[PDB]
Design an enzyme around this catalytic site. Structure first.
Site: not given
Ligand SMILES: [Cl-]
Length: 179
Positions: A36, A104
């Site tokens: 990222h 998650k």
């Protein structure tokens, strides 16, 4: 409500609400924190990425791959804790125009504004079965940044088959199952 998608369009994304069960076919990319950060820095510098994230799906995962012949096969690929990306997901979305995030544990409620404005859905993937989910990976198309980031942190481009169940955990309408 259950769906199966090939190319997840923006219309598809808008149709989704929290609690919906989703199965995915087609292309997804893995991107954890370091990837990222790298992608953000590149796009800030007006550099081109060696892959197209426009309206794409990313997967918070750290896959293990093995070479069989001269081609990659997936050994394990479970979702990792999405909150690691909380500081950067907003900017990442604005610079890439991704359509969905798979992971998650969910992400901060403050991203609901971005998900709604940009049309993004957050999908919770099953935890505790990393090796099993590898079977949904039908083809490993490509890896990027492998040398710099290492295998599980690198960006892997995947074809997945009947990937799920993924549960819509944060939608593009202001809802989060975690709130
Ligand atoms: Cl991470």
């Amino acid at each position: 409500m259950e769906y199966t998608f090939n190319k997840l369009t923006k219309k598809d994304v808008k149709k989704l609400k929290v609690g919906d069960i989703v199965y995915l076919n087609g292309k997804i990319y893995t991107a954890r924190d370091e990837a990222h950060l790298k992608i953000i820095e590149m796009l800030k510098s007006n550099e081109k990425l060696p892959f197209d994230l426009n309206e794409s799906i990313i997967y918070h995962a750290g896959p293990i791959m093995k070479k069989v012949n001269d081609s990659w096969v997936c050994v394990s690929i479970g979702p990792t804790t999405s909150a690691r990306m909380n500081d950067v997901e907003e900017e990442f979305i604005k610079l890439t125009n991704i359509s969905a995030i798979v992971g998650k544990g969910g992400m901060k409620k403050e991203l609901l504004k971005t998900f709604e404005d940009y049309g993004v859905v957050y999908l919770a993937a099953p935890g505790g079965c990393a090796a099993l989910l590898a079977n949904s990976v039908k083809r490993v198309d490509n890896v990027y940044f492998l040398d710099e980031l290492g295998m599980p942190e690198a960006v892997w481009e995947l074809e997945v088959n009947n990937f799920g169940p993924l549960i819509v955990a944060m939608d593009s309408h202001g809802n989060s199952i975690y709130e």
